Design a protein around this ligand. Structure first.
Ligand code: 117
Ligand code: 117
Ligand code: 117
Ligand code: 117
Ligand code: ADP
Ligand code: ADP
Ligand code: ADP
Ligand code: ADP
Ligand code: ADP
Lengths: 399, 387, 408, 393
């Protein structure tokens, strides 16, 4: 059949769009038909002219990453580096449309390299899901909380949770009561995957098992916002979520002077009064930094991460202090307790994003040490954030 | 030739060639030099990017764009572009749009409009910073600061000042309209000239940083939640019991119970400031990427309180509202200057400046975002309530 | 113990009437001769109901002025609770000297605060400024639709809309002068934060009366508006809230002082460098790691609470009144002197009304020279008290911080 | 004579220098009177006939008298099948009356039930290592079962009630914040937990000599300052209480309806507190009740800052959904029945009134737990009454 004939068929059969994929056979043609169909529903039918769609691998997207596809959005990818981190050198891909961001981050990388590099450590690793359940009375929910805190109750819960996956290993439970409601924060490792779907599956089976001991328990929602996913929350800041990371470096006074165009003293004064006092006056929870979100977002988009997780992933406290023999060298550290990231699944299944992951040497699963690729990616993110903090802070300090 | 050049858009001719060479140079520094093969770069207009949106360019990252709609908002119909890699997001949001359309559509209102910049300055003593604060709060002091701020642009118009003291430090939050631009650069230029003028009245004042994190830009902050930043928007709709039953697969009562206990109580137990919603960030992020917005601003732009109530003659219909006090957005400048993103903006009829009434396109885009968020909230909440 | 019909005197007989006619114990001072035997009977009625009838033995009740407490400060009175009052000072503030009364049961608190005052005095004193003054009340109202509540918000934001509201608000008292309106929307709900001066009074009752009259006026223009609650927690009163921290509530105050290196060494037993490092890592970084909003200090609450109890303030207001950011930095020719400042944006306080009407608390207020209304300049006594509180807090911060810096 | 003693001084060593306590106070008062802009201002500040024996060198210094706070009683509070007569020290008119009305509605509803969910006072010191890599190593060390046991042994060796439970650590570059949590019998426990923290830190220092103990309290406890950590992880006693008020009682005692109360609770205590940017303040006036009971019972009133954290929830229940279900959850009630101001006779009297004075001989900590339950129950009574008044107008 012809395009116009498919169009007539879809319009004359009230067959909702998007079903084009199962209707036709080729992937790009279904996309071309949906764009044509959509075009007649717009005040400017030619508005899709510059929205590219051709020569793109839609097989990996369909049934996995997006629906009602009408094309793709190209985000410029720049590179910042080398980032000298833990005695290795990384060339960091950054997808952004903000001018000077890559340049500024690159300058930061330069100052770190000339300073002998940066060191980083993964402090914790565990994705979470925090469902909300209800009991008839608060006295009952209290009983469930006490039961879940015994070694016997936990083991049975861990047992049912762990049985849904090879990588699902329940670490701990933080429960919280609000009258007859009970919020249960399940935390578990997830190999190299960010882990949402995996932890969710585990949580559902665990809640099913919990319901066998407490038949009167009502499962209100698999997510009761106690995770907390994609919303700002003190719980992620205080207890961590995903990967908690810290990185540090010392920048020689000469480098601060020549590369950063400022002094260690001026940098410290700006850090304390902007990142600590300013954030405090603004009523911030977890936003004790200059622009971690810029770096997190740019790397996330380039590497197939869930960019909406930039909300909590960007949590960061940037600290600066005088170091060295004469207290003229700049010590800097960035602590990020909740980097939600992965190197397998979701958008990391797509080839262009796998390319950016390969650039860093962390694409896909780490066979001999599950989770190591994801941990390495989190360290790179924390290191690039520190590079970004150094540069922007120097620019603010200099004027 | 592609060889002894190693021995770029500033030197060479073609833009696409400079990228090829940059990719070649970078290739030699990679553990897996072949990785760059699946990273696209050809047939892309780098002219608009170079010197404006990105540096050290090695290609571009394609983000699948799906469409959700029609979104029946304020008696208009919108086809919403969403750039995402999260499966079922577009489908779920589309389902939400469906429920709203069958309910007679959604209504929205822009409550406030004003981008901010909050520099930190210091005086010798707290007694001096207090004097500067008092002067900034007089009608004459504001008038002179406003005269100086507004002289930097045709679109920059200072609306108000909120000053806060921390001993000898003084944080000044400048809030101004910025036409159809998100306004960061414009407001920053205005802030610098205003601070310069302030310095003439108080020579002992030290300008510590043009941004003292009191804006607050790209970090979570109660100040953006309470006072707004960019566009403050509210939207609402009533979904008929039958639609909740047939499209959403649940009941009004179940939806309400989930909203209260998840979006209100749950977020409260989590210690959230501004995160009284299910997944506004998913919608904000997807639209932001497709429309050339600054995706990092998703941090504060996603602030939202979702409310659900029993409505109608028999209290069986679902009333829903989403209030978003800090949508940082624009239809001119930055990534909106690129053609593919302009295409998504054109889809919504808000591309570029609204020559007649500067700001209307940006205000319309903020209303669409708030409306799409409500569609997304409706669908995901129904799915959680139904199990 | 005469029968009931005969009883028109005698404790045992009153008790029999109370039990038999089931007339409540609070109706006692309204039926009994003196205030004192009225509570006596009450304690006796209560004592019978306890698992240990002797419990009240050491709870004082005699020789106390209940006339001022009745129908004003407390109900079902069974006595009074004595809180030890100590004095810290002199506090050299704004070229004046204050002897600060502190009611507390925490050992070493007055001593430590006194040491702080000493370091300040030897440093040339402290300076303070009142940055803002205005008590608030934040009611919640509802409109049928969010589009309507948005309309009310815009109306309240026009110059004419504000004038009619202000006119209504101000007609309730000579001191009620509406300053501004902060309005916030949540769907069809509308939260309105009314802010106004209140002379020397803390102002809750006054601002509330003004808010009710203003809401009725608003109701005339928007008849479909439902007044859900005179307080929708948007004030915010007695609960932690970022809004009080960011916009202030009551009196916003800042105080500062410079402590000479020698004084930090000899009086505080530490160095300026050590103090600064503890302040930054405890009051800034530590509070940040703890997820604090407004708690960037060491123990402002100890000082605020002690002064509030001694001066008849509402001690429950210690929740927001204690908000404070303490900052320390190197000062002087050789950067060896300690610069310190305390910023408190929401001190809820008053020198007239409530517990300040009682004699013992008026005594503590008199000690500071701020008791009652300031005839010549309304509000000045309350402002002076707020400055004293901020200054005493700084004295307390200096001493405790030095003790943390020095020992361990 | 007072006159000659005064000329001698021309100091705050009065109690030691002389003999009788009351006279010491008398003399300090006379000396202070000459420094005041108004010499007779102390006239109505009482000071006579007071057992300063227990106060001198334990509860207050430079004593010049005492401040009388009116004590009222609210009750009976029907809680967990028991009846309590609750002492409330306040100067706020109608507070006791309103709280009493709340108690009445609860009693007529069949009483309230409560549960202690957690119990453990905390202290959060801040230490520093040369590098973030070192602090990370200490964090990992503290997380192993062996490293924990060693710290726990040193902590528990300091006192009879020092049982170190979970250990929460947090890193900020080279800084390390360690939240020590432990039971403390019937004592509020700050002094005890502090003593335990110091020995534990010395033991930790033996394994990590490069570690600098910056401050025994790094504000990570967190004591007397608002903090999300206390709300989320609890501090002291975490308690929950609940009750169901029959429609008729809501109508006759509270002068309103269940529907009206629910609408006010949701829009004020949840939405309003959310719009205000509150962390832990999802209630109407828990602080009023916490403060009044704390003052009357010798607690540390400054701890009302975190002790008043509370989320009040209301729901329609019953056959026709006209009855009122109510719950109050308070995760951080810092309280005790031994030590500090509870050592004073008048406050012990108020504690006795509740049957929780001093140590619980048979079951250590039970008196303090009982007092926390009473506080949470009285808060719920206060929430019910004020909410009804706001609902009614
Ligand atoms: C490119 C970017 C990092 C940048 C620079 C810079 O580093 N230029 C650069 C280019 C090449 C090499 C090295 C550096 C300067 C920048 C800052 C000072 C001086 C010069 C450039 C700014 C910027 C930040 C706040 C302003 F008000 C104005 C501009 N910005 C914008 C950052 C913005 O997104 C987030 C910010 O708003 C968060 C905050 O601080 O609250
Ligand atoms: C696609 C997406 C919106 C979705 C659905 C859904 O609506 N499916 C859909 C598809 C087609 C038509 C209609 C609906 C369900 C979803 C939820 C319940 C039942 C079925 C699907 C979920 C999801 C959310 C939380 C979970 F624990 C597990 C899955 N998710 C993932 C949401 C995630 O990003 C953010 C979330 O974590 C934030 C939160 O709530 O804390
Ligand atoms: C008396 C009090 C202020 C004090 C001192 C002191 O200054 N002693 C004093 C006596 C005489 C003269 C001069 C000084 C020391 C104190 C501190 C260090 C060294 C000596 C005394 C402490 C104290 C604070 C935290 C601890 F872990 C232990 C004790 N405390 C208890 C304060 C407490 O309530 C609030 C606190 O918990 C808030 C915080 O910091 O988190
Ligand atoms: C006595 C007190 C509990 C009270 C009542 C009341 O219950 N009266 C009472 C007396 C006897 C029997 C039964 C009831 C009413 C009250 C409320 C409504 C109607 C009647 C009385 C109020 C009060 C609270 C906020 C206002 F704006 C005005 C008044 N207040 C003052 C409470 C105040 O401290 C804390 C409050 O500000 C916190 C908040 O809600 O934000
Ligand atoms: N309607 C409009 N609204 C805003 N800016 C406009 C408009 N029309 C043209 N402009 C131009 O675009 C600029 C804003 O874009 P840009 O310089 O990239 O800064 P920003 O970071 O604020 O977006 C304005 O300074 C002005 O020169
Ligand atoms: N019991 C106390 N009452 C009041 N102030 C005290 C008390 N103990 C100490 N101080 C305060 O602490 C400071 C330290 O004095 P002191 O304890 O005698 O030690 P030092 O001799 O080392 O100065 C004094 O300036 C005083 O203000
Ligand atoms: N200088 C003053 N400042 C404040 N109130 C004053 C003053 N002089 C007299 N008053 C009166 O005292 C009262 C303040 O006390 P009160 O009614 O208990 O309310 P609040 O809760 O504000 O203390 C008001 O009625 C007011 O008329
Ligand atoms: N002075 C008071 N002391 C104690 N409780 C009081 C007082 N006034 C009112 N109440 C409470 O209010 C309830 C009844 O209120 P209401 O019907 O207004 O009558 P009244 O105020 O005359 O007691 C009583 O059961 C009691 O709990
Ligand atoms: N049941 C008990 N609970 C608590 N402390 C007890 C008990 N029995 C005896 N004690 C003693 O009381 C001490 C606690 O009082 P105190 O030192 O004043 O500190 P705090 O007031 O900070 O709790 C314990 O160290 C112990 O010696």
């Amino acid at each position: 059949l012809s395009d116009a004939e498919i169009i007539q068929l879809v319009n004359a059969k009230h067959i909702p769009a998007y079903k084009l994929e199962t209707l036709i056979e080729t992937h790009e043609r279904g996309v071309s038909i949906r764009r044509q169909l959509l075009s007649k529903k717009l005040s400017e039918p030619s508005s899709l002219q510059y929205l590219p769609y051709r020569d793109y691998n839609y097989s990996l997207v369909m049934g996995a990453c997006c629906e009602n596809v009408i094309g793709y959005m190209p985000i410029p990818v720049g590179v910042a580096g080398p980032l000298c981190l833990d005695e290795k050198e990384f060339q960091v891909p950054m997808a952004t449309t903000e001018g000077c961001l890559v340049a500024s981050t690159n300058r930061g990388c330069r100052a770190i390299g000339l300073g002998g590099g940066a060191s980083s450590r993964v402090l914790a690793d565990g994705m979470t899901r925090g469902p909300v359940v209800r009991l008839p009375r608060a006295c009952d929910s209290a009983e469930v909380k006490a039961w879940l805190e015994t070694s016997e109750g936990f083991a049975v819960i861990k047992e049912a949770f762990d049985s849904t996956s090879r990588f699902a290993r329940l670490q701990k439970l933080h429960t919280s009561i609000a009258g007859r409601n009970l919020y249960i924060r399940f935390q578990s490792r997830s190999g190299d995957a960010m882990g949402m779907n995996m932890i969710s599956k585990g949580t559902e089976k665990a809640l099913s098992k919990l319901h066998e001991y407490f038949p009167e328990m009502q499962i209100l929602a698999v997510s009761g916002n106690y995770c907390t996913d994609k919303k700002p929350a003190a719980i992620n800041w205080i207890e961590g979520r995903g990967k908690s990371v810290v990185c540090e470096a010392v920048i020689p006074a000469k480098v601060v002077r020549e590369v950063l165009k400022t002094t260690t003293e001026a940098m410290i004064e700006v850090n304390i009064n902007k990142n600590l006092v300013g954030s405090a006056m603004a009523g911030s929870i977890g936003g004790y930094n200059a622009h971690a979100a810029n770096i997190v977002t740019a790397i996330y988009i380039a590497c197939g991460q869930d960019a909406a997780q930039n909300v909590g992933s960007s949590n960061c406290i940037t600290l600066m202090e005088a170091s060295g023999p004469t207290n003229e060298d700049l010590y800097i550290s960035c602590t990020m307790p909740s980097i939600e990231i992965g190197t397998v699944g979701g958008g990391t299944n797509l080839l262009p994003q796998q390319a950016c992951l390969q650039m860093l040497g962390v694409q896909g699963a780490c066979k001999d040490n599950p989770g190591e690729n994801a941990r390495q990616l989190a360290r790179i993110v924390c290191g690039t954030v520190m590079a970004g903090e150094l540069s922007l802070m120097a620019a603010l300090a200099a004027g």
